[PDB]
Amino acid sequence: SSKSVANIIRKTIQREQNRIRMLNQGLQAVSFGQVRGVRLNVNVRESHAI
Amino acid sequence: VERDEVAAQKRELEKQIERLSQPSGAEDSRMIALAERFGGVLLSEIYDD
Numbered sequence: 001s002s003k004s005v006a007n008i009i010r011k012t013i014q015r016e017q018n019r020i021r022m023l024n025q026g027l028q029a030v031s032f033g034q035v036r037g038v039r040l041n042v043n044v045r046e047s048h049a050i
Numbered sequence: 051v052e053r054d055e056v057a058a059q060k061r062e063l064e065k066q067i068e069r070l071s072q073p074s075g076a077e078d079s080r081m082i083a084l085a086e087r088f089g090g091v092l093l094s095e096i097y098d099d
Contacts (some may be wrong), residue, residue: 007073 017042074098 020042027038072078073085074095085092 004072 014043 022041024039029036030038070077073082074092076092076094081092
């Protein structure tokens with residue numbers, strides 16, 4: 001059960017990362033003052049990765 | 051003797067039960083690594099539902 005929990009967590013993380021990276025594409029090259037692009041950075045906390 | 055036979059049966063039953071365990075009951079012994087090491091998905095899992 002523990003291993004399954006870990007695996008489902010990992011898979012959900014991957015799916016969400018992929019979807020966010022996909023959505024990120026539409027905001028490429030947006031000119032705002034000196035701003036030229038926007039990104040949603042997604043990461044896994046090491047304290048939680050371990 | 052009877053206990054040993056029942057134990058053999060029992061061992062077989064638990065090994066069978068395990069064989070259906072994870073990630074989706076299949077040849078997970080090495081299929082796991084063969085699955086994540088490449089950008090693919092298990093067909094049985096794809097047909098899980």
